[PDB]
Coordinates of C-alpha atoms and ligand atoms in Angstrom, one line a residue:
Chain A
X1 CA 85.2 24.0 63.5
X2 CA 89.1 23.3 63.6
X3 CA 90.6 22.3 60.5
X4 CA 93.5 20.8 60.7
X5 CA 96.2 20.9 57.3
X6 CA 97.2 17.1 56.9
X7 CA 95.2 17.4 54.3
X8 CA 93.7 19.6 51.9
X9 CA 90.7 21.7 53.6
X10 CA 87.6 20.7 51.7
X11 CA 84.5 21.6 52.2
X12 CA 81.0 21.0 51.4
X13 CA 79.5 24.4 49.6
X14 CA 75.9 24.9 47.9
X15 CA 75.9 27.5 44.9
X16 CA 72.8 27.8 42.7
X17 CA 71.2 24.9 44.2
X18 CA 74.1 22.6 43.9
X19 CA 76.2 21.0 46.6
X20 CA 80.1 20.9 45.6
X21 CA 83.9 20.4 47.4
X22 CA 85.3 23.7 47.5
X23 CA 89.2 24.2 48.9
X24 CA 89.5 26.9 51.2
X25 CA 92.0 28.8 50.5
X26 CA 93.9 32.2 52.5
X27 CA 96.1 33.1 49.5
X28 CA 93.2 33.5 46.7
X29 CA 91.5 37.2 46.8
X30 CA 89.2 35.6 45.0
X31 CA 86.2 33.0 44.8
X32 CA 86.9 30.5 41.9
X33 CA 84.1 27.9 41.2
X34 CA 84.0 25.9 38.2
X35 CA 82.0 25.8 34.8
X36 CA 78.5 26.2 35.6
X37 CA 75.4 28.0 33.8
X38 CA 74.4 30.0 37.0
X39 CA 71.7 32.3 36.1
X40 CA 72.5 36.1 35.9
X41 CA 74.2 38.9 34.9
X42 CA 77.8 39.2 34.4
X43 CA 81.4 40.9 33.9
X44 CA 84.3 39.2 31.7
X45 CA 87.0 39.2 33.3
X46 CA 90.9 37.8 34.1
X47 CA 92.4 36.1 37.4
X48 CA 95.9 35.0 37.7
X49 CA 97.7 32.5 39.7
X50 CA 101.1 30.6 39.2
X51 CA 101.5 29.4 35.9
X52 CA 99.3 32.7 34.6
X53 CA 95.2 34.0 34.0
X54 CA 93.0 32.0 32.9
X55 CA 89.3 33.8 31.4
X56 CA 86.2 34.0 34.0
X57 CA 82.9 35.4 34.5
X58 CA 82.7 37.5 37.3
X59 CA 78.9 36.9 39.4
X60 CA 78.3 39.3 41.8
X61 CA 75.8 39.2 45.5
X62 CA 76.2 35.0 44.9
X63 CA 74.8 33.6 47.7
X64 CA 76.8 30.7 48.9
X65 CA 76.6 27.8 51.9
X66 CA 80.0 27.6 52.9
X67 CA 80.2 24.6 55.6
X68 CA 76.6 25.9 56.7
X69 CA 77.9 29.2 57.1
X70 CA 75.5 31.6 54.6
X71 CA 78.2 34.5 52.3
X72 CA 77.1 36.7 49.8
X73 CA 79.7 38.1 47.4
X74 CA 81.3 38.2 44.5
X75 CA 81.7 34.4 42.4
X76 CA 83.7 34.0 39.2
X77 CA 83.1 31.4 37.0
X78 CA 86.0 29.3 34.6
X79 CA 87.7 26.7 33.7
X80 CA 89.4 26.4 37.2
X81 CA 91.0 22.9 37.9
X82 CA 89.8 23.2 41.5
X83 CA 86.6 25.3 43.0
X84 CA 88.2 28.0 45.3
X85 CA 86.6 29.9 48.4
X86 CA 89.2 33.1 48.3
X87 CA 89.1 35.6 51.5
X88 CA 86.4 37.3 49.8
X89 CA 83.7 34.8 51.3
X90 CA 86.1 33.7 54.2
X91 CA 85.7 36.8 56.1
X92 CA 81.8 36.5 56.0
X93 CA 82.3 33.5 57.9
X94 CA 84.7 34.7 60.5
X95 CA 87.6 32.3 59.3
X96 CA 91.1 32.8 60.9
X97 CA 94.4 31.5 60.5
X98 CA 95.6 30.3 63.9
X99 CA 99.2 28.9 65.2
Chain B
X1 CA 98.5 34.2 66.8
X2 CA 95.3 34.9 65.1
X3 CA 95.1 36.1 61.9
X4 CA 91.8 37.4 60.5
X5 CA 91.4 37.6 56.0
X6 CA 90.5 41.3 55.7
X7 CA 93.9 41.7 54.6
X8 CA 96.4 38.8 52.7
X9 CA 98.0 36.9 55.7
X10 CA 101.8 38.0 54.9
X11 CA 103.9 37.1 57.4
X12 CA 108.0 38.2 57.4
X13 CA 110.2 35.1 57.5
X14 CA 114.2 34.4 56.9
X15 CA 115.4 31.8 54.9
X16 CA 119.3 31.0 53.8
X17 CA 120.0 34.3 56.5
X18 CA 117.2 36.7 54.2
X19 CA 114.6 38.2 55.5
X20 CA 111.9 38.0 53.2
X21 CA 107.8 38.2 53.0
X22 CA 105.6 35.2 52.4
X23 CA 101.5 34.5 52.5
X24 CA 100.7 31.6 54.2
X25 CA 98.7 29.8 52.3
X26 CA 96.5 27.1 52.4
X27 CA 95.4 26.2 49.3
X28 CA 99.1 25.4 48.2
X29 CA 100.7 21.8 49.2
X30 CA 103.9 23.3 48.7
X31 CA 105.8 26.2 49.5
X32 CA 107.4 28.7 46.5
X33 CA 109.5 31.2 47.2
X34 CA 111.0 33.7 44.1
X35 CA 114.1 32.7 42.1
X36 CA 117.1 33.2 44.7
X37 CA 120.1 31.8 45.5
X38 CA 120.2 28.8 48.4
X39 CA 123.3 27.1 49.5
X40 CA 122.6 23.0 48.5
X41 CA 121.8 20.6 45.6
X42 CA 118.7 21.1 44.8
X43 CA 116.2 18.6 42.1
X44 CA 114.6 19.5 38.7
X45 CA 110.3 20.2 39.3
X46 CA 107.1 21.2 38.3
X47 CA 104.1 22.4 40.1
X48 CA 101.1 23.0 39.3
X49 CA 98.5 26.5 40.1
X50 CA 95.3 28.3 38.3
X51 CA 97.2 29.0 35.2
X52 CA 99.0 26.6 34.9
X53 CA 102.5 24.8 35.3
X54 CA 105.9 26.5 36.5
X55 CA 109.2 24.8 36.4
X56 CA 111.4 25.1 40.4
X57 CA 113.8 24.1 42.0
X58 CA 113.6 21.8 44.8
X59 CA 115.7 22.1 48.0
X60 CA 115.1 19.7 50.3
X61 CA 115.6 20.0 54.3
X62 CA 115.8 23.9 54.3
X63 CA 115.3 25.9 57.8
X64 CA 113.6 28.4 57.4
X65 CA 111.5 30.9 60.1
X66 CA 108.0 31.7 59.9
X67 CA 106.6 34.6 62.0
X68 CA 109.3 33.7 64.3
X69 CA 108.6 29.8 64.1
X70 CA 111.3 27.3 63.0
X71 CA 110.6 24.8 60.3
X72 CA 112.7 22.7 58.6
X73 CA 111.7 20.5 55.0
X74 CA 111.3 21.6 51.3
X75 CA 111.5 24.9 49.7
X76 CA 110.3 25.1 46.2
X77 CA 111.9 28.2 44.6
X78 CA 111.0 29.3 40.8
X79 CA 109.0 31.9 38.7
X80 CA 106.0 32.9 41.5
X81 CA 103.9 35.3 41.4
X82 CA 104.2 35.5 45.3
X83 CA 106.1 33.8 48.2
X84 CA 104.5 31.5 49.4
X85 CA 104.3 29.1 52.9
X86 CA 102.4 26.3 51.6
X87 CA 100.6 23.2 54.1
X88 CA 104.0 21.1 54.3
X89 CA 105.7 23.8 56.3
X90 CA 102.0 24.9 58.0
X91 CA 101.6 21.8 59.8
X92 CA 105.3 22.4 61.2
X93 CA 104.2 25.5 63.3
X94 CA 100.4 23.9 63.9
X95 CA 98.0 26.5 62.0
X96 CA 94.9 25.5 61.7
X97 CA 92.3 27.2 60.1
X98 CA 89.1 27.8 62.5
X99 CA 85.6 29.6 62.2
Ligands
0Q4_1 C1 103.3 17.6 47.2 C2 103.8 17.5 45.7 C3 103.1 18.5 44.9 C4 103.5 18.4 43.4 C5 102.8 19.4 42.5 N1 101.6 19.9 43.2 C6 101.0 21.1 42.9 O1 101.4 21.7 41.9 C7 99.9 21.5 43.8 C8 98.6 20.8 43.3 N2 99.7 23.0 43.6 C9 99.4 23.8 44.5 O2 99.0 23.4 45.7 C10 99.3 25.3 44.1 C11 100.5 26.0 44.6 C12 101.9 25.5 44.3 C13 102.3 24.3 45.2 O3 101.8 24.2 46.3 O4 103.0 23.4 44.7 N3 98.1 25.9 44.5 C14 97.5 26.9 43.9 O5 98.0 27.4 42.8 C15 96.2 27.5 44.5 C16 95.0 27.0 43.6 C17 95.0 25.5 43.4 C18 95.1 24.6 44.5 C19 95.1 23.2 44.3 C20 95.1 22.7 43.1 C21 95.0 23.6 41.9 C22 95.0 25.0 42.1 N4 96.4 28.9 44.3 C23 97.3 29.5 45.1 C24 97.5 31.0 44.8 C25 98.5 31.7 45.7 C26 98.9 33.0 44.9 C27 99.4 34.1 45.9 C28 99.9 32.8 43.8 N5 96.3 31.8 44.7 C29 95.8 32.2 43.5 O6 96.3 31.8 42.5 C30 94.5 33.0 43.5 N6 94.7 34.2 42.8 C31 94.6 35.4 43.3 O7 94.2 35.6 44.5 C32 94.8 36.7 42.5 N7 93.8 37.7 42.8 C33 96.2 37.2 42.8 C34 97.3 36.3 42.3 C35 98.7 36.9 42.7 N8 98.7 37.1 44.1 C36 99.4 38.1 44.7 N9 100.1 38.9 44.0 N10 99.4 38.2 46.1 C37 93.2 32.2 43.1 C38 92.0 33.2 42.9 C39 93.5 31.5 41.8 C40 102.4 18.8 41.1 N11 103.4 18.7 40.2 O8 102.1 17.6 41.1

């Protein structure tokens, strides 16, 4: 699809077996998905943004439905005010910026 | 043009007569650019990212190029992390996002 930036760019996204509104965004490296007891092993770790880091777990070979488009990678896990799809996954599903 | 998300999309733009680097983003409703000086009044804000809440300055009605593309509205200019070309100026040279 096309989407357009009126307005934010949400998406519907399936993680775990939950459905959930993800924003995708270009300027996050990262996939950011909020507080959620997916099953697993994983890393501590620290992602930054404006206004500073905030504590995650770090999920790795997630499997993730991004818009019906299938993405394996990398997933971390916090206290994020908004669930993020970072480049990480966007480049699975052949996203581009175009203008 | 098209820009693929192997690599951050940072584009060169020039604002106030400065050439200067920026990420378009689309996961920001605003654009932030790094504490410099602009000719104009400018307002008292606060926005809002992953860690949290940064105080800027807001200059309203500021031309600024993009890749080569003219826009003109509001520059948000405070403690960033990055530069940053946020959905408000977007719009103004038609990216979409498409996959
Ligand atoms: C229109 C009026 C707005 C008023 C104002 N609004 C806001 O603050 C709105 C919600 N904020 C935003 O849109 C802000 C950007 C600032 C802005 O646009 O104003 N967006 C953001 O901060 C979004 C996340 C988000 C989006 C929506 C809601 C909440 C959070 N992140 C943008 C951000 C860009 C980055 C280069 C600094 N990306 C990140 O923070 C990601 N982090 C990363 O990718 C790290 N690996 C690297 C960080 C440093 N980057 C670098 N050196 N290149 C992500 C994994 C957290 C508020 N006061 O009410």
């Amino acid at each position: 699809p096309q989407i357009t930036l009126w307005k934010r760019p949400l998406v519907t996204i399936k993680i775990g077996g939950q459905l959930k509104e993800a924003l995708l965004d270009t300027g996050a490296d990262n996939t950011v998905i909020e507080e959620m007891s997916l099953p697993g092993r994983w890393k501590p770790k620290m992602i930054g943004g404006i206004g500073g880091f905030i504590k995650v777990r770090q999920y790795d070979q997630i499997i993730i439905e991004i818009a019906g488009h299938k993405a394996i990678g990398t997933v971390l896990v916090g206290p994020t005010p908004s669930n993020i799809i970072g480049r990480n996954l966007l480049t699975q599903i052949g996203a581009t910026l175009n203008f």
